[PDB]
Design a protein around this ligand. Structure first.
Ligand SMILES: *[C@@H]1O[C@H](CO)[C@@H](O[C@@H]2O[C@H](CO)[C@@H](O[C@@H]3O[C@H](CO[C@H]4O[C@H](CO)[C@@H](O)[C@H](O)[C@@H]4O)[C@@H](O)[C@H](O[C@H]4O[C@H](CO)[C@@H](O)[C@H](O)[C@@H]4O)[C@@H]3O)[C@H](O)[C@H]2NC(C)=O)[C@H](O)[C@H]1NC(C)=O
Ligand SMILES: CCC(=O)OC[C@H](COP(=O)(O)OCC[N+](C)(C)C)OC(=O)CC
Length: 1551
């Protein structure tokens, strides 16, 4: 392995280059070139003498059409002098490859790195780990690190040498050997020592190649050339096509080969620099110091605490952190930026803060001043300060917000100064910053909201979480000024837990999100467990003792968020049952186990499964367990057992949850859920056929893959159904999107509530209306001795988590109690006037760095800055009649700036070369608002003004600009104003002024002549069709837009927006039933003004005539826009409905006026829908009486509504005889055929069967279109519909279906069984033929049947039945417990007092008594073809053409009417109940409001068919006879039988 023969003198010419460019977008290239000479002398066997002298360099920024390898002549260059400390250093050889270098006192570490690169360019391996061929792999080292390389050796032909003689300058050493070539390829995925700074495969495509020429092998090596080439491909904005390039090269070539003349001087100050990898330094020491590690391992022969590699020391809480790669830390010759003295750190920060504060008042010019970039520069600058400097700056600012006036208008700049300084301190993320925050809070400069907002942003800003940092944070957490308050305390504890988790709990978080390589939580530091877990344990126990809900929620969430298995031992005395706990707290504890599944999936899966198995637990807990269980990748056996259990499980909610979650894992196709898709598909054949509604628990996973950009976007949404109301209780929402190995952080939401009904009742209590009137309902409840259920406390959560902040808001009863007081206080606060100034500034950061192959740092950044600003005076005046008058003078602004940059930094010149793209968004709202709301009259009048002094201000600005830059690091200014920055305006650029006429708005869009996408989307108002089509809009190319306001000559004419509302009940002669003509006509009102009572009355009258007991509604809207061309607008709607007969009508009226252009347009609509068969319950299998459904739609429009294009659209439906055959040959038909033979009347099964019996198959839609343009539009729509995947392709036939007649008919057959439909389309222009619950009458799952010998409950229970002579209570409402006092009871609400009393006649008939608040009704059966109807002890007649109404204050109390063969009805609108009887059977219909608030024979109405046998004493029953006996009044007309049974039941023991 002999090489570098002793006594000889060599000489190698040195060339190298490093360039940064923007890839395919342009050809400009920014970078430097280097020239030098290297002389090596063979001093002895193992020590060589070297020297690098004659250093020159030049900087280049020019177009390179040929490529980055183009030779540039020295005449075209601008050579400089390289600050190289040319001294006779030395190099030593160790049995082959080079081992270590020697440097003198003139040791700037960057110079040593460059020398290391030059040395390592000579690295060769003649042997492995004649024979011209050879190949193997070696674990070699270089400047970048010790990554492995692949070798390849082969001789080089003479033709190549003859063609290109440069590879072999002087060939006279062929001798007995020849010339070879070596190719080395290095991969970076397997290394030993690495240098990097990562914060925030990973879109980092690296490469390395070499080429060395040789002489006679293994005995006379004689290196003669060496070329290394490296690339780095990176995406700028994390969603791009890799246009970011950083390229490098190093060149060596032999020049001289001759005898030594004079030995080089010996180095007098040995400074061993170790191996060839990059080495850090100290950025603050006045005397140069380096951290070089010399392992000196014997080797030979064939994280853990070890020396490993040299790392920078961990900084303290007072000293600044030490980094050796960022521009600010090693810009000035490897030292900190302020060491130069040309910049003073404190003064620069002061000027930056003053500029930012001053420019933040004139918000319309934020984009042109680059304020947000200035904020980022200030944050970077303050990342280098120490504690004394920030303290001195705070003293020098002469600012203290405590002395400031919060609502003053004079000290706007001072308040802005405080705000910007506070935001910068929050975003700095260093030890001194946290010390400053501790000093602020401890002495009391930020009391509650500011402090909590500050600590909500800490967990996602801190750079290096050290041990002493966390210890100080804990010491602050143990301060009385933080614990006693609530919102600050919860924010601080959550931030503590999150930072602990990130810093130590997850090793992946340590390795990825933090720069471990540049800085080396020790394993021996077991302080976490002992110091922290007992703290949270003890304080959670104390909070549980005190019975304080927000504290319990906060501390459970924190202990869950720490994410370690010890939380299981923490919780096991809680979940098991040793400590009492509410359902809300239990579900929060179960949901808190989310972080444990992502770290130790198996143990969390076991715990969640064990929770799931139990059935006696609450359904919300089980549901949440299911959702957490199927995010763990279970095996096939688990899911098989899941599906098997689905069928046999009684709980509807859990079944719905598991079925939905299993079924939702199917449409996915992506390499992260792929392994579970097959298992999901292998389960359907075990699932239950029953399909559940939407009010129950469900799951949904969404996928959106874009193979063009390799973008994966997800969404998870879960909810647990509520047992009291429609609105679900719990909600989850996650938007994690990953494209590669690095992804944007996840966004999560979690909302929870104990009970929706209780929450609404407490929130709406601010009405000052406590019920006092007592009706018969409370007497009924008291005599039955009804005890209400034990009330549950109200609790709630709301958590938001995203890139910026982590927030948490635990609810309580006390907070909702305090809400009205704060509302009132704010009400008199805004009585006269109140100024405000609110600013939010949050940012996101990510920096990645690693040395290049030329010996220079490479830094990549990605910043986004978000601003939200409000300012103005708001005044309100509230009156007891709700005369809510508000005047506001606000200004609104929103801006965003995202910028990604790639490049490198050269320490010896303090310069920075960058290529990247940045974008700006900006919106401004200088508006005045006047709001007058008068709620008794339904008026909602707005007035909007253009704010004075903002006649011509920017309203919109979007600009995307790519650039290349070459800027000094000492200067602290935005790069847009630097001289070296060059934008890349495309060659073919044209401007554009969108408004062709001088309208109120101006738009100025400029871009390249190409980009036809935006060039058509933006300005082309002609092709305004299929224009939006949300796409990416090629955001990687130059664009800039701006929209001003052209309003000049300040105007006092408001833009108004009015609204109204009304209702009425139609009087006697209008509903004469002779006014219903089969076809309607649109009505033209006599009055066409805005918000007119006459039009409302006319429409309401014409909408309800001919319908018995019909209610008409109306909604009137007005919009007014003044200016050079006024635009009035009138819109009215009307509709009718009645509970007696299915006969509804709709009407509309639209009209806009243009007083300047004299343009008037109108449209009138009149429609009706009727279903021919009257509502009926029983099967009535005799005869058919086939169902019918006809409707009419009529429109008319033009300058005058009456005279103009009128469309007469008529429709009709039908049921085919094939469905007669199917119904006559179906299961349910025979089922209740046998039942009616037995005598069953209103059972559930054939209620569903008659529901099917009232089904419609054929559809006959016809429309007469007098406009050919409408026909053409319909033809275009038909072609578009035929373009769909499922729709068959049908074209225009030679013979049109119809000629001279305008009509399109569509019909779907019945034999398809609604699996798919066939739709025929017959237009005069095109003919198309396609290839292959519902309407219900007075029946739903809600109702409760009460038949002669059967009983169907609210929730679906059946049991034997037999009544008696004395009254029984069917449906009742009972009073509850006062939330304020656990002794007093509240009263029945005025609009929810109902009692229903039944009876069995001695002759088999039935009697009905209903207590409707303060009224009573009795239904004597009789034998007069209808049960006798007495109202309040007075007789009323019910006939075919009359009906009973009780009307008060234009509201309906109850309706009595005759229907069917022997049926009469009672539907209470004010009470939301319905009843029907025939003297032999009664069925009861309720509303959703009565959930968990009724008790009687029907049941408790809880969507549960298991616990509907509960008595007044809240005791479950076990025999229908026992239940019927129990729920029986014993007042009068009763003796024995039921009385004896009730006496025995009282004597006996229930359950
Ligand atoms: C690592 O570093 C070394 C050191 O520079 C590089 O080696 C150089 O390689 C270039 C390759 O282009 C050499 O340039 C060549 O020089 C030849 C000799 O130059 C004499 O003759 C020309 C007239 O032809 C005179 O103008 C000049 O002053 C000299 O007197 C030229 O003949 C070559 O011409 C090429 O282009 C013409 C175009 O028509 C062709 O016809 C030719 O056939 C030929 O291809 C060429 O210009 C340069 O001399 C080398 N320097 C040396 C040997 O010291 C390595 O390239 C570099 N490694 C890299 C870049 O990977
Ligand atoms: C409407 C309808 O009738 O079809 C829906 C079918 C059930 O059809 P059916 O005629 O069997 O009516 C139910 C009678 N019963 C319950 C007694 C069997 O269900 C599907 O949606 C498939």
């Amino acid at each position: 392995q002999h090489n570098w023969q002793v006594g000889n003198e060599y000489t190698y010419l040195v060339r190298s280059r490093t360039l940064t460019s923007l890839g395919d977008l342009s050809d400009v290239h920014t970078g430097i070139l280097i020239k030098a000479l290297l002389t090596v002398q063979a001093k002895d066997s193992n020590v060589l003498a070297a020297k690098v002298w004659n250093g020159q360099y030049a900087r280049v920024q020019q177009s390179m059409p040929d490529g980055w390898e183009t030779e540039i002549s020295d005449q075209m260059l601008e050579l400089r002098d390289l600050p190289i400390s040319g001294k006779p250093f030395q190099i030593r050889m160790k049995h082959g490859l080079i081992r270590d270098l020697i440097v003198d006192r003139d040791v700037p570490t960057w110079e040593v790195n460059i020398l290391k690169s030059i040395v390592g360019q000579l690295q060769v391996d003649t042997q492995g780990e004649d024979e011209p061929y050879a190949s193997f792999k070696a674990m070699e080292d270089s400047v970048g690190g010790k990554c492995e390389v692949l070798y390849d050796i082969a001789p080089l032909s003479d033709f190549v040498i003859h063609r290109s003689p440069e590879l072999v300058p002087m060939p006279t050493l062929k001798g007995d050997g020849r010339h070879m070539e070596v190719i080395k390829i290095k991969n970076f995925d397997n290394c030993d020592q690495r240098i990097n700074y990562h914060f925030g495969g990973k879109f980092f495509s690296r490469s390395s190649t070499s080429r060395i020429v040789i002489s006679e092998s293994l005995k006379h090596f004689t290196i003669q050339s060496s070329v290394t080439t490296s690339k780095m491909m990176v995406s700028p904005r994390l969603y791009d096509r890799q246009n970011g390039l950083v390229l490098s090269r190093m060149n060596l070539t032999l020049a001289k080969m001759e005898k030594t003349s004079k030995p080089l001087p010996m180095v007098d100050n040995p400074e061993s620099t170790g191996n060839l990898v990059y080495i850090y330094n100290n950025p603050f020491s006045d005397v140069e110091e380096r951290r070089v590690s010399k392992t000196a391992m014997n080797s030979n022969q064939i994280s853990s605490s070890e020396e490993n590699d040299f790392w920078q020391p961990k900084p303290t809480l007072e000293d600044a952190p030490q980094n050796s790669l960022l521009p600010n830390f090693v810009g000035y010759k490897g030292k900190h930026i302020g060491k130069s003295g040309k910049v003073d750190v404190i003064n620069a920060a002061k000027e930056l803060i003053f500029q930012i504060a001053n420019e933040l008042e004139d918000a319309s010019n934020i984009p042109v001043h680059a304020t947000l970039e200035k904020f980022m520069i200030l944050c970077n600058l303050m990342r280098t300060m120490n504690r004394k400097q920030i303290s001195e700056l705070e003293s020098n600012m002469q600012i203290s917000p405590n002395e400031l006036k919060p609502n003053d208008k004079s000290q706007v700049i001072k308040q802005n100064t405080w705000t910007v300084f506070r935001d910068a301190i929050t975003q700095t993320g260093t030890g001194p910053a946290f010390l400053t925050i501790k000093e602020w809070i401890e002495r009391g400069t930020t009391k509650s909201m500011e402090a909590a907002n500050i600590m909500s942003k800490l967990p996602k800003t801190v750079r290096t979480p050290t041990d002493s940092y966390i210890r100080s944070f804990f010491e602050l957490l143990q301060n009385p000024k933080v614990s006693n308050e609530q919102f600050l305390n919860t924010a601080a504890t959550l931030s503590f837990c999150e930072m602990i988790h990130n810093a130590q709990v997850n090793k992946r978080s340590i390795h990825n999100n933090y720069p471990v390589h540049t800085f080396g939580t020790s394993k021996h530091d077991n302080s976490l467990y002992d110091e922290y877990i007992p703290f949270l344990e003890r304080e959670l126990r104390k909070a549980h003792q005190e019975k304080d809900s927000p504290r319990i929620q906060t501390y459970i969430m924190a202990l869950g968020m720490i994410g370690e298995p010890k939380i299981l031992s923490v919780f096991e005395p809680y979940l098991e049952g040793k400590q009492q706990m509410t359902v809300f707290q239990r579900t929060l504890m179960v949901g808190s186990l989310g972080k444990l599944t992502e770290t130790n999936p198996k143990l969390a899966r076991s715990v969640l499964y064990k929770i799931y198995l139990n059935t006696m637990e609450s359904h919300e807990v089980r549901c949440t367990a299911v959702f957490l269980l199927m995010k763990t990748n279970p095996p096939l056996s688990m899911l098989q057992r899941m599906a098997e259990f689905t069928k046999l499980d009684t709980n509807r909610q859990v079944n719905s949850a598991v079925k939905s979650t299993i079924q939702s894992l199917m449409k996915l196709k992506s390499p992260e859920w792929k392994d579970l898709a097959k298992k999901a598909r292998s389960v359907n054949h075990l699932l239950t056929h029953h399909e559940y509604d939407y009010e129950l628990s469900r799951g949904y996973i969404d996928e959106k893959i874009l193979e063009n950009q390799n973008i994966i976007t997800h969404m998870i949404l879960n909810y647990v159904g509520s047992e009291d109301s429609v609105i679900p209780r719990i909600l989850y929402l996650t938007w994690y999107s990953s494209n590669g190995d690095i992804k944007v952080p996840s966004t999560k939401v979690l909302a929870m509530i104990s009970s929706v009904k209780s929450f609404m009742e407490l929130s709406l209590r601010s009405v000052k209306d406590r019920e006092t009137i007592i009706s018969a309902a409370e007497k009924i409840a008291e005599e039955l001795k009804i005890v209400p259920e034990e009330l549950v406390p109200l609790e709630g959560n709301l958590m938001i988590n995203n890139k910026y902040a982590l927030k948490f808001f635990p609810f309580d009863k006390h907070i909702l109690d305090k809400l009205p007081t704060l509302i009132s206080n704010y009400i008199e606060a805004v009585k006269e006037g109140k100024f405000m100034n609110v600013n939010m500034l949050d940012t996101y950061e990510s920096v990645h760095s690693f040395p290049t192959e030329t010996g220079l740092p490479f830094v990549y950044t990605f910043n986004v800055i978000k601003l939200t600003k409000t300012s103005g005076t708001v005044q309100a005046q509230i009156n007891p009649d709700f005369a809510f008058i508000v005047n506001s003078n606000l200004r609104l602004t929103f801006s965003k700036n995202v910028q990604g940059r790639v490049g490198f930094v050269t320490p010896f010149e303090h310069r920075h070369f960058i290529s990247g793209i940045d974008s700006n968004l900006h919106v401004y709202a200088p508006l005045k608002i006047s709001l007058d709301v008068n709620t008794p009259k339904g008026n909602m009048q707005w007035k909007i003004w253009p704010m004075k002094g903002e006649e011509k201000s920017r309203l919109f600005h979007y600009s995307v600009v790519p650039f290349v830059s070459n800027h000094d690091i000492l200067n602290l200014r935005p790069l847009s104003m630097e001289k070296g920055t060059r934008p890349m305006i495309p060659d073919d650029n044209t401007s554009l002024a969108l408004p062709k006429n001088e309208g109120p708005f101006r738009l100025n869009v400029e871009t390249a002549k190409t980009n036809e996408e935006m060039w058509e989307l933006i300005d082309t108002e002609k092709l305004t069709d299929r224009l939006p089509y949300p796409w990416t809009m090629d955001n990687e190319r130059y664009v800039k837009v701006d929209m001003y306001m052209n309003l000049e000559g300040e105007q006092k004419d408001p833009v108004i927006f009015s609204t109204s509302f009304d209702s009425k009940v139609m009087t006697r002669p209008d509903t004469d039933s002779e006014n219903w003509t089969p076809k309607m006509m649109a009505v033209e009102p006599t009055d066409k003004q805005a918000n007119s009572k006459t039009r409302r009355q006319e429409m309401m009258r014409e909408a309800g005539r001919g319908i018995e007991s019909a209610k008409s509604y109306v909604v009137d809207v007005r919009v007014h826009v003044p200016g050079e061309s006024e635009s009035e607008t009138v819109l009215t709607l009307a509709w009718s409905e009645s509970n007696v007969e299915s006969k509804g009508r709709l009407l509309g009226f639209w009209r806009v006026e243009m007083p300047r252009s004299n343009a008037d347009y109108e449209v009138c609509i009149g429609s009706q829908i009727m279903v021919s068969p009257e509502t009926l319950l029983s099967y009535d299998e005799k005869m058919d009486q086939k169902p019918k459904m006809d409707f009419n739609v009529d429109i008319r429009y033009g300058k005058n509504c009456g005279k103009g294009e009128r469309i007469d659209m008529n429709g009709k439906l039908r049921q085919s005889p094939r469905l007669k055959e199917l119904v006559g040959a179906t299961s349910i038909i025979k089922d209740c055929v046998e039942d009616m033979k037995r005598g069953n009347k209103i059972l559930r099964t054939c209620q569903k069967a008659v529901v099917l019996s009232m089904l419609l198959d054929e559809v006959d839609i016809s429309m007469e279109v007098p406009s050919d343009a409408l026909i053409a539009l319909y033809s275009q729509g038909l072609f578009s519909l035929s373009e769909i995947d499922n729709l068959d392709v049908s074209l225009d036939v030679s013979n049109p279906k119809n000629a001279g007649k305008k009509k399109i008919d569509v019909r779907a057959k019945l034999n398809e069984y609604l699996d798919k439909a066939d739709v025929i389309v017959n237009t005069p222009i095109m003919d198309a033929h396609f290839k292959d619950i519902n309407n219900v009458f007075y029946e739903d799952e809600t109702s409760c049947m009460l038949d002669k010998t059967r009983a169907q409950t609210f929730d679906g229970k059946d049991y034997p039945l037999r009544l008696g002579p004395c009254w029984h209570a069917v449906m009742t409402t009972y009073p509850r417990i006062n939330p304020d006092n656990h002794n007093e009871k509240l009263h029945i609400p005025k609009d929810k007092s109902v009692s229903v009393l039944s009876r069995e006649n001695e002759a088999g008939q039935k009697e009905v008594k209903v207590l409707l608040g303060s009224d009573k009704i009795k239904f004597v059966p009789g034998t007069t073809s209808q049960p006798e109807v007495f109202v309040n002890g007075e007789k009323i007649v019910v006939s075919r053409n009359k009906a009973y109404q009780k009307v008060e204050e234009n509201e309906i109390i109850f309706e009595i009417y005759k229907m069917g063969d022997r049926f009469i009805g009672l539907t209470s609108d004010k009470f939301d109940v319905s009843l029907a009887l025939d003297g032999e059977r009664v069925m009861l219909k309720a509303s959703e409001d009565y959930r968990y608030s009724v008790r009687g024979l029907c049941g408790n109405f809880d969507h549960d068919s298991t616990n509907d046998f509960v008595g007044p004493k809240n005791c479950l029953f076990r025999k229908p006879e026992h239940f019927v006996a129990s729920y029986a009044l014993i007042s009068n007309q009763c003796e024995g039988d039921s009385l004896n049974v009730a006496k025995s039941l009282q004597d006996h023991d229930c359950i």
